[PDB]
Design a binder for this molecule. Structure first.
Ligand code: NA
Ligand code: NA
Ligand code: NA
Length: 362
């Protein structure tokens, strides 16, 4: 049934920092290397520009991978980076210059790739964790989310718009993947402010892609990058929903509504326990002193647990002003959720803190 399990806090991980490492990363991923687990932590916020690898067992920094802006190993515009599958070969996204790059553990460039649409158009290049969007590698190609190719989408355009593209890491060839946006977007605005986002994860055990549109009750699953199945993944605390696109002409109001309204966020596969976690944001109303552009520190959330057959087996609600759930990862011991919320009474900008949540019978 839907109430067999719950998530329960067990231990904490705490990494002491200094001025060389900022506590926030938008591209942090757990990985295994040499028999141990680590956190790949892209450290490109503010004036910083490198990658830090954290040692989970020893709760400390393991190494620092330099990133240079110029020179023979110059990476002008890193935003997003991933262990591929470990720190010896890392892929980095450079959206602003239409480039994907591979680097080694010393930050040296292996190869630069131009990444544009087949017809030579700019297309957003990203992967990261701020919403779970890890990319994935199949048959030596990297697969990435793709955004819409024209600002004024009609109903008919969604099922003709690709959700993913891949780039061959030998040849650089980009291919559109025949997985299309679902026909669940009704508004026809001249310019869309948001509302069609999704999170995804890739289950290498079953060669299985799972996508969760922020505005939709159901998860989309495919095992052959073509044929789609849908599974209910609705929070018991939220009214059933379908996406609501924002209208750019509404101005800041469109952004505020998306920020504050209930919606889903990460979908995350747990490779150790063979379960999925879907995060859900509870309803909120943005207060005057709060920024329209970021999730409020007080927004409540839940995590839905689904088993390997995509059956909901439990859901646990979390308070606001405590967690920074946009820094979450699955480790050997469980689901780790950061406590680096500015309104947490224990917040310390020089300590990266996570709580480990284990699955217990309810
Ligand atoms: Na120091
Ligand atoms: Na710091
Ligand atoms: Na640097």
């Amino acid at each position: 049934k839907q109430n067999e399990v719950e998530l329960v806090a067990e231990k904490q991980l705490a990494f002491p920092l200094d001025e060389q490492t900022y506590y926030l990363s938008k591209s942090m991923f757990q990985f295994e290397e040499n028999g141990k687990e680590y956190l790949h932590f892209e450290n490109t916020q503010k004036s910083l520009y490198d990658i830090v690898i954290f040692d989970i067992e020893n709760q400390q920094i393991a190494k620092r991978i330099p990133l240079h802006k110029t020179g023979p190993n110059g990476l002008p515009a890193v935003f997003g980076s991933r262990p591929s599958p470990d720190s010896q070969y890392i892929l980095v996204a450079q959206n602003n210059i239409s480039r994907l790059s591979s680097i080694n553990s010393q930050g040296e460039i292996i190869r630069n790739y131009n990444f544009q649409t087949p017809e030579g158009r700019f297309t957003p290049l990203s992967f990261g964790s701020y919403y779970n969007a890890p990319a994935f590698i199949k048959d030596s190609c990297i697969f990435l989310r793709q955004e819409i190719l024209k600002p004024d989408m009609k109903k008919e355009d969604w099922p003709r718009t690709h959700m993913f593209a891949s780039q061959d890491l030998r040849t650089g060839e980009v291919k559109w993947i025949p997985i299309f946006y679902p026909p669940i977007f009704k508004e026809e605005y001249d310019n869309i402010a948001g509302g069609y986002g999704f999170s995804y994860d890739y289950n290498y055990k079953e060669s299985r892609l799972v996508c969760g549109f922020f505005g939709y009750d159901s998860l989309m699953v495919t095992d052959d990058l073509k044929h789609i199945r849908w599974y209910n993944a609705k929070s018991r605390y939220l009214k059933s929903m379908k996406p609501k696109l924002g209208n750019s002409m509404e101005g800041i109001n469109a952004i505020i509504k998306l920020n504050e309204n209930p919606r889903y966020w990460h979908i995350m596969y747990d490779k150790y326990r063979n379960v999925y976690y879907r995060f859900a944001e509870m309803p909120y109303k943005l207060a005057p002193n709060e920024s329209p552009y970021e999730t409020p520190k007080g927004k409540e959330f839940s995590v839905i647990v689904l088993n390997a057959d995509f059956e909901i087996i439990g859901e646990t609600k979390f308070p606001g002003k405590k967690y920074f759930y946009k820094m979450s990862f699955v480790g050997r011991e469980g689901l780790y959720i950061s406590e680096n919320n500015l309104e947490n009474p224990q917040f310390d900008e020089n300590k990266l803190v996570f709580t480990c949540f284990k699955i217990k019978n309810a």
